[PDB]
Enzyme design. Structure first.
Site, PDB file in Angstrom:
ATOM      1  N   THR I   1     -51.065 -18.806  -1.268  1.00 27.38           N
ATOM      2  CA  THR I   1     -50.091 -19.809  -1.761  1.00 27.38           C
ATOM      3  C   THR I   1     -49.161 -19.409  -2.998  1.00 27.38           C
ATOM      4  O   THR I   1     -49.763 -18.865  -4.078  1.00 27.38           O
ATOM      5  CB  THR I   1     -50.543 -21.082  -2.077  1.00 27.38           C
ATOM      6  N   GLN I   2     -48.034 -18.981  -2.718  1.00 28.99           N
ATOM      7  CA  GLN I   2     -47.062 -18.279  -3.739  1.00 28.99           C
ATOM      8  C   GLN I   2     -46.107 -19.572  -4.259  1.00 28.99           C
ATOM      9  O   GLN I   2     -45.831 -19.188  -5.670  1.00 28.99           O
ATOM     10  CB  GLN I   2     -46.328 -17.533  -3.090  1.00 28.99           C
ATOM     11  N   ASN I 104     -53.317 -13.946  -2.752  1.00 32.85           N
ATOM     12  CA  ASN I 104     -52.821 -14.972  -1.948  1.00 32.85           C
ATOM     13  C   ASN I 104     -53.775 -16.343  -2.334  1.00 32.85           C
ATOM     14  O   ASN I 104     -54.228 -16.797  -1.680  1.00 32.85           O
ATOM     15  CB  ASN I 104     -52.844 -14.698  -0.496  1.00 32.85           C
TER      16      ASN I 104
END
Lengths: 199, 220, 213, 215, 201, 191, 204, 191, 215, 199
Positions: I1-2, I104
């Site tokens: 998740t960015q 990530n």
């Protein structure tokens, strides 16, 4: 950065080099050898990236020595030059790009003498004289000026004297000593080390 | 590039120009932007020229493989499903603007396919650089359930609007009429522009060019 | 951001005759992929013996034209005479250099008669250099028109071809043929071909149509 | 101006026999938001000329302030002269070119319609100092949409009456209501004649949605 | 673009090509690159054409006023000093100018070299341009101070020919001037295509 | 783009606009935003165009295969779980604004919300799209628990009309859908 | 650009019953020539040639990959290759490197292997074919070559005036170019013989 | 930040929240958004904090000097013109969301809008601020021409309460102001 | 998740005599928008341990899915064993560290409260694999605001009863309603004992606004 | 890029330079002079930006010649060195930054010989020997090795021979000919041009 020259004659190939192994600002080794005897009638200099010049000369050396050892006879200089262009062009589009700049200088028993040319983008060019490095910008006028297709090898050494005295007149480099070979029907012959005294 | 299509009361009329540019220089004065898919389905392409050519041949190869296995006539929703699934997988790197049209057992069907995978069933579509000019002709002069000669007047009017208003367009007008039985393909339909005559004789005779070395090689 | 430049198009042609000067241009004013108008000539009668053409960015073309028209009047009220052809070319070079670090984007060609009744053509660049030539072509289609007049007018690369001087009537059909071939391959070459002919008796204009695509 | 906050949209204009008709809508938008549903985008200069504009609206109120003063300045002289529609088109061009030369432009696109001495005038003014004359003008997406409709009729028939030109604008404003994402169904039509400048009210179009049943 | 200049016993020889390009496109073939300043001074062109054409024209303005005030022609080292100070005020703003100054002086021949980078050096031989490095080698092989007039013509004529033959941006025609004690004199203007048939045999 | 979903006692009521844009140009006047996955389960899609068409085909593929293997009518919560598994797995590559609604025999009408992140939540009424931000205040004051079906058709009609008027992205024509035990009723309005 | 690294120009032109093709001779690196004998036209069977221009790596690479697939085709079949068949073969070979493309633009000229019917085409760097009836050009100096052939080509031309037209088209366009030159070789082929000439150009 | 202004027959009604933030931290719970320029003319400020305080001091300086020279009560359109001259001149340096409202003897109640661009327009009701985007749909359906004063106080109270509930930027407490011919009434509410 | 789309906010927790109490609110926010007014941010793991979290909520439903399966997996063995609250704190740390090592991460911040073998456990888990134990924990702005209130009482009196700890959380949740820009007046309180896990309902605070009259 | 040296003696200042005026890759002028006679007992070399080296030497030259012409006597080398540091440090914080690197070499009638140092950031340093350029990285070891504060000038020239033979042994530069001055109680004296033959 370093200088090579490719005078081609009627029955001889006159090549010369330099002996300087450069560094940051200093000159570590002053008797370096750019030359690589592939076979009895084929030579190979190299100019390019400091890690790439050694191994590609070593890689092309053994694959030509396989051909003589398996089939019992030597490659032609034409087939030798076109084997080198294949290996650079194949691994060009790769994660490890290759960066060297050198021709061949070969004598055939049937086709006589021959001289090629190579870029780091792997392009071949049959040429009657060639050069690399920054000194090509100051010597391809003289070698175009005093050239004859029927020149003799005694004039060609004297023509190489004219090509080399303009080097140590208008450079920002040192380049003291230059090694010279000559290829004929009898194979590889080593001429004397062309130098310039300091005192 | 200006392609357009419409569905009249019995079939589908497609149209395009024949200019293929390169940069700002006209490379091809007579191109061909209407392609074969099946004997009832054609397709018009726009955008990258090689991407539209290599895509429209693969689907036409697959539908020939599909229909020869089933022994029947293909359906337009089959070609729509292949294109929206292929172009979505390549994430829009293959730039191909398409207009899909054909007549099935269910009747005429018209689609517009965008290079990411979004598809639309519409009664009339325009794609290309000069598509905005042809769309203004459609909305001003559309009515449902036209006849064939009324529809052929409308598309050739709309393609000509993109000719005289867009720089990337302008050449001879193609048309195609696909109906329940009749298939018509018109590689010239209307020539709006000519080339002027050459006024000055420019020919010097044979021998006005210096030749260094000649060479003759006979054949059989 | 706000970019201050844009390309508009147009193509200018000039031919220095023996006792005449022919200046030709198209009338299309385009921007991007659209057409603003089909009636926009690039010819400008400065004096009775001098016609200038201006291509490139059209906002600079309207400005640079009105600067020259003022300085012609400032010359005459100060010197009781009109400028020559070469004096205008010498004046224009200082004007183009005067905005060296925010340049005009304008290609200029000045044609017209000298003080001996011979055709003179001066080409320019957007920074101020100039020279006197026999024929130049400037604008978008400049590369499609220079090598052809080298063959016809310049008589280059032909063996045993004589050097006849270009007459007036032969020069007219040379101009009318090259813009037909330019309109086929260029997208900027428009419809009406305004042709101005400067002789020792006045300036004649002439309009020839092209293809409307 | 580096960033236009509140923007207008397309403005149309076309000549006819003895006058110029110009129409534009009545919406000011802030991005995708249709914030100001009721504004006027057409200024009635004194008796024979007329102005509409696109682009930034705060810059348009500035030029409305400046041009309004200059017309009063000549009327107070009372010498029997006035500004021609071409002179205002010439003045406004130099205003744009001097403004962009300081790298601080005025984000507008202006259309000038005038009728003096029995001559219909229709002039264009760009932000970048690009100006010309045309029998029909269109800004924004109208240059992509309504401009093919204008040139098609005019190249077929060069002259138009007043009723032919007025009906043809209402067709083009209908098309711009369909295909432009930032249009609005409330517009006003302004027309110069030899009798003066008259501005009509908040007119609207009549859409067709019969193709919605076609899946 | 290739110019050269060298002085010897009988004055100064100046030679140049005539080709001006624009990217990969050739603008013209007949550009007079050796800018004539006075009956006793000559200037060259290098890089920016309008930059070299403007400031050398402005340099001629100061030299004419200097002669009217002092009743004497200006010296060669004087004109090179005035040009170096004018270009230095626009340093870092992107001027392209690498010209040379030639002329006879009361101290004999005069040869200087002015850059847009503030360089101002004297010397005996120079070569300026994109194909300048092709001209240094053939000239220094044939240069001597004790040459003849017909010998110095043919040295500078072939040296331009060897440059344009190797370089892509250099070409056109070979202009040749001779600076003498009374003043400069135009020698000839030869085409490269005509010299190619001369030096073929 | 403005989508609308309100449940009631017997079932749910869906609604959306029809305008599909690209930049500032209307690519399509009328567009079916709502998608018939199953005979009792719809979804209305928002965000990207090519993404939401591709996701809705795969869920229809998986739910149609599963329900025949069930030999049962599928659950609405089962279908909303499948959008969550795809949108969370490929949240770096998709912009999907799916609202899933439909009648179920076990539980009646249900409305679920799957925004761009990939989460899932059950609500009494759900709105989405770019034009949904302008009707937050209207939908809170007007909503009243215990509506009939015809009130909800009146409720969503005024809600979409205010969003179409104010948003430049939303507009076109109003499409509605009413899912109950009896069937599915679809209609097109104006005003 | 990458196309303007070495430069070059290839022109083909269709005549009445014969076809002609020509190219330049210069091999250089961006300002500095190396030689004047760089081959850019390669024979693919009899009465059918091909020309290549662009980056000199992909010139020598594609001409060997195409020769690789050609000899396999003419041994599996007994016949020679048709000109339409070669155009589809080259367009396949460029499209395989869709994203790592070869930087070249081929030009194909040749006759019918059954009749005297000529054929010309040119392709993009990714492989879009384009057939015409008058001329095709490729290389850096493209716009100068369009100005020649739009003003000199005539429909029905004997092999003498076809030679004189394509000669004046090349010598005026390439001399206007900077990075191309140093001699022009011209192939003019017909039903019965193949004629190869070298022109006298400016060596500057 | 959410500001509110509605005119009626006798005068105008103003309203705003009290929450002043910085990032995601409440710098101030209660804040006077509305500013007494003159005895009959207020403005409610939005956008930057230090900019709108500096602009409101200069306009109060200029209008106060001018009205004593008038020996007249100032016009509301006169005061709104002064914000336009400053915000258009320094539009590259300011982020101001000023709404000017107030009663005037010549013309009654007036409401003007000066957004971030620098334009000026007269409206029947004006809203601004970051939280104003959530109540576009509510303020259109609820508004009815011909209200009394007490209906407008009810109208703005429900409008600000919905914006405070939904927006994270707006909140705090509700401040109101009613300007008429008789005087100025100010009050603080909740709910 | 960015990029966290729908986020939570501060979560509090403190030990007492024979149990751990954890409270958090019921709001999911999308930027400045309070979009989802009614969600649960506390998961009741089986009998003795308990989880609350901040950060991205879609990642929280993922860990709710995984941890829910693992508890069922040991109960089906039925050998008379269970996961201690420390073992889940040890497991969840390795889950975060392996996730961030692939560039990530999972945008969360998790608080684990447990009570087993007469021992109150209170563990912290960061996104970056930072984990420790403390008698009082706070995430987000609560670590800037409520954490000085927690440590002040605990350094004065080390042990607390249940009623003292429950009242002290309601005071800190009141302060977070004032000074946090993205809080909400609806929260739930979850408490482990030796009797099990009990979660209270949507409680609310009582504000004071008497300083608004002070200008 | 170019090399200078600063051997300081008991009653003499020994300075040397090079004669190479560089270019892109070529050597245009090979008898350049870096030196600037400020007065009868003060010298000034210069190394730095190619436009800046000439004018600052010209600017400092005239302002010192004003002092001798107005007051009738010469500046001390200390006051001369501190006038130069003022002019570089003042216009450093300006739109026209100045980029040169050179000391002074002066003989006082009262204080005897003196040697300074300067950076382009305008820092002074009284030093018993100094150097600039890249050759300082290869010569400040020898000149630190064979140094004596009571050295004689015959040894100092011989020490300069040792400093210069290591230059044309381990460089990537050419640097053939070196000009040498010497300053004493009698003023400026020009020693011979130190060179190295090529053949």
């Amino acid at each position: 950065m370093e200088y090579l020259i490719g005078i081609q004659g009627p029955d001889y190939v006159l090549v010369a080099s330099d002996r300087v192994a450069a560094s940051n600002i200093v000159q570590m080794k002053d008797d370096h050898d750019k030359m690589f005897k592939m076979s009895e009638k084929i030579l190979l200099l190299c100019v390019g990236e400091a890690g790439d010049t050694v191994q590609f000369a070593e890689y092309i050396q053994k694959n030509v020595q396989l051909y003589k050892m398996r089939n019992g006879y030597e490659l032609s200089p034409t087939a030798a030059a076109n084997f080198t262009r294949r290996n650079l062009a194949d691994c060009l589009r790769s994660r490890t790009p290759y960066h060297v700049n050198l021709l061949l200088a070969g004598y055939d028993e049937h086709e006589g003498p021959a001289l090629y040319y190579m870029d780091y983008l792997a392009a071949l060019a049959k040429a009657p004289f060639a050069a690399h490095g920054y000194g090509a910008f100051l010597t391809l006028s003289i070698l175009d000026r005093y050239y004859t297709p029927t020149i003799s090898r005694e004039r060609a050494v004297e023509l190489l004297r004219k090509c080399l005295e303009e080097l140590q007149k208008r450079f920002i480099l040192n380049l003291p000593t230059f090694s010279v070979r000559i290829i004929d029907k009898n194979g590889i012959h080593d001429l004397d080390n062309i130098s310039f005294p300091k005192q | 590039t200006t392609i357009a299509g419409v569905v009249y009361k019995d079939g589908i009329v497609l149209g395009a120009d024949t200019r293929a540019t390169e940069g700002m220089v006209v490379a091809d004065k007579n191109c061909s932007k209407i392609h074969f898919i099946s004997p009832n389905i054609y397709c018009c392409g726009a955008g990258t020229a090689a991407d539209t050519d290599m895509t429209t041949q693969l689907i036409s190869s697959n539908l020939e493989l599909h229909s020869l296995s089933t022994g029947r006539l293909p359906r337009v929703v089959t070609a729509n499903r292949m294109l929206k699934q292929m172009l979505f997988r390549y994430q829009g790197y293959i730039g191909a603007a398409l207009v899909l049209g054909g007549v099935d057992v269910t009747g005429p069907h018209l689609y517009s396919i965008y290079p990411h995978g979004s598809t639309d069933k519409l009664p009339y579509v325009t794609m290309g650089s000069g598509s905005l000019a042809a769309m203004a002709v459609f909305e001003d002069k559309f009515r449902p359930d036209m006849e064939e000669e009324e529809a052929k007047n409308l598309v050739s009017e709309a393609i000509a609007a993109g000719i005289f208003n867009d720089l990337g367009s302008g050449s001879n007008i193609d048309l195609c009429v696909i109906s329940k039985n009749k298939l018509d393909f018109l590689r010239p339909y209307t020539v709006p522009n000519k080339k002027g005559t050459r006024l000055g004789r420019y020919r010097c005779e044979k021998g006005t060019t210096a030749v260094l070395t000649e060479k003759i090689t006979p054949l059989e | 951001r706000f970019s201050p430049y844009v390309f508009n198009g147009g193509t200018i042609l000039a031919i220095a005759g023996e006792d005449f000067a022919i200046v030709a241009s198209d009338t299309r004013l385009s921007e991007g992929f659209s057409i603003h108008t089909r009636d926009s000539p690039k010819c400008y009668k400065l004096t009775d013996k001098t016609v200038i053409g201006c291509s490139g960015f059209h906002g600079d073309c309207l400005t640079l034209t009105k600067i020259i028209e003022a300085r012609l009047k400032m010359y005459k009220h100060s010197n009781n005479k009109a400028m020559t052809t070469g004096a205008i070319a010498a004046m224009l070079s200082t004007i183009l250099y005067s905005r060296r670090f925010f340049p005009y984007y304008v290609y200029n060609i000045i044609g017209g008669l000298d003080e001996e009744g011979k055709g003179a053509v001066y080409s320019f660049d957007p920074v101020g250099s100039y020279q006197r030539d026999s024929f130049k072509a400037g604008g978008s289609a400049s590369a499609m028109l220079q090598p052809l007049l080298d063959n016809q007018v310049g008589f280059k690369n032909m063996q045993n071809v004589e050097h006849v001087p270009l007459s007036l009537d032969r020069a007219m059909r040379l101009v009318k043929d090259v813009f037909i071939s330019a309109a086929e391959r260029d997208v900027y070459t428009g419809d009406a071909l305004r042709i101005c002919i400067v002789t020792k008796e006045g300036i004649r204009e002439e309009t020839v149509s092209l293809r409307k695509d | 101006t580096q960033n236009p906050m509140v923007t207008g949209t397309s403005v149309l204009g076309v000549k006819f026999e003895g006058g110029v008709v110009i129409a534009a809508d009545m919406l000011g938008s802030y991005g995708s938001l249709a914030r100001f549903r009721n504004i006027s985008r057409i200024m009635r200069v004194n008796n024979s000329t007329m102005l509409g504009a696109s682009g930034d609206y705060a810059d348009f109120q500035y030029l409305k302030q400046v041009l309004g003063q200059m017309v009063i300045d000549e009327e107070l002289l009372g010498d029997g002269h006035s500004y021609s529609p071409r002179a205002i088109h010439s003045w406004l061009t130099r205003a744009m070119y001097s403004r962009r030369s300081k790298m601080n432009p005025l984000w507008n696109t202006m259309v000038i319609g005038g009728y003096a001495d029995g001559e219909s005038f229709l002039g264009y003014v760009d932000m970048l100092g690009v100006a010309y004359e045309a029998p029909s003008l269109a800004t924004g997406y109208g240059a992509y949409l309504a401009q093919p409709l204008l040139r098609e009729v005019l190249e077929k028939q060069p002259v138009l009456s007043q009723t032919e030109a007025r009906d043809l604008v209402e067709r083009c404003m209908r098309v711009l209501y369909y295909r432009d994402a930032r249009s609005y169904n409330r517009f006003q039509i302004a027309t110069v004649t030899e009798k003066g400048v008259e501005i009509e009210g908040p007119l609207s179009t009549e859409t067709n949605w019969d193709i919605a049943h076609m899946i | 673009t290739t110019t050269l200049a060298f002085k010897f016993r009988h004055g100064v020889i100046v030679a140049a090509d005539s080709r001006a390009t624009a990217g990969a496109y050739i603008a013209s073939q007949t550009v007079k690159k050796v800018i004539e300043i006075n009956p006793y001074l000559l200037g060259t062109m290098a890089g920016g054409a309008a930059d070299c054409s403007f400031w050398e024209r402005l340099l001629a303005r100061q030299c004419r006023i200097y002669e009217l005030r002092n009743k004497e022609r200006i010296s060669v080292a004087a004109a090179s000093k005035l040009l170096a100070n004018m270009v230095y005020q626009y340093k870092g703003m992107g001027l392209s100018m690498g010209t040379m100054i030639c002329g006879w002086d009361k101290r004999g021949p005069g040869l200087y070299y002015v850059d847009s980078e503030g360089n101002r050096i004297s010397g005996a031989t120079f070569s300026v341009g994109s194909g300048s490095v092709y001209a240094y080698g053939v000239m220094d092989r044939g240069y001597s101070y004790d040459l003849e007039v017909e010998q110095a013509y043919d040295l500078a004529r072939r040296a331009i020919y060897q440059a344009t033959y190797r370089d892509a941006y250099s070409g056109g025609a070979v202009n040749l001037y001779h600076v003498r004690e009374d003043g400069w004199i135009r020698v000839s203007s030869d085409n490269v295509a005509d010299l190619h048939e001369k030096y073929s045999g | 783009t403005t989508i609308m979903a309100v449940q009631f006692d017997g079932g749910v009521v869906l609604g959306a606009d029809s305008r599909t844009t690209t930049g500032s140009y209307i690519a399509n006047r009328v567009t079916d935003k709502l998608t018939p996955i199953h005979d009792r389960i719809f979804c209305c899609r928002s965000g990207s165009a090519a993404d939401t068409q591709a996701v809705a085909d795969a869920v229809t593929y998986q739910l149609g295969f599963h329900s025949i293997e069930l030999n049962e009518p599928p659950l609405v919560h089962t279908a909303a779980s499948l959008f969550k598994e795809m949108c969370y797995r490929y949240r770096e590559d998709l912009m999907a604004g799916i609202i899933i609604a439909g009648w179920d025999p076990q539980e009646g009408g249900q409305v679920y919300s799957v925004p761009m992140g990939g989460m899932m939540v059950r609500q009494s009424f759900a709105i989405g799209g770019s034009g949904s931000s302008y009707i937050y205040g209207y939908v809170d004051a007007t909503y009243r628990e215990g509506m009939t079906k015809e009130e909800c058709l009146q409720f969503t009609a005024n809600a979409l009309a205010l969003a179409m008027e104010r948003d430049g992205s939303s507009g076109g024509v109003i499409r509605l859908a009413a899912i109950a035990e009896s069937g599915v009723e679809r209609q097109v309005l104006l005003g | 650009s990458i196309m303007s690294y070495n430069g070059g120009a290839v022109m083909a032109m269709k005549g009445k019953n014969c076809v002609a093709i020509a190219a330049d001779r210069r091999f250089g690196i961006q300002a500095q020539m190396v030689t004047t004998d760089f081959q850019k036209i390669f024979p693919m069977g009899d009465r059918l040639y091909i020309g290549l221009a662009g980056l000199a790596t992909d010139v020598q690479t594609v001409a060997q990959r195409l020769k690789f697939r050609l000899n396999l085709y003419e041994l599996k079949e007994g016949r020679q290759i048709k000109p339409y068949t070669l155009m589809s073969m080259v367009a396949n070979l460029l499209y395989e490197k869709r994203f790592g493309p070869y930087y070249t633009e081929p030009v194909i000229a040749g006759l019918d292997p059954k009749t005297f019917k000529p054929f010309i085409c040119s392709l993009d760097l990714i492989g879009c074919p384009m057939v015409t009836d008058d001329f095709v050009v490729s290389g850096t100096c493209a716009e100068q070559m369009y100005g020649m052939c739009e003003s000199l080509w005539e429909p029905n031309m004997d092999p003498d005036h076809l030679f004189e037209t394509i000669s004046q088209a090349m010598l005026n366009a390439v001399d206007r170019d900077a990075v191309s030159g140093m001699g022009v070789i011209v192939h003019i082929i017909e039903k019965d013989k193949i004629t190869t000439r070298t022109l006298k150009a400016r060596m500057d």
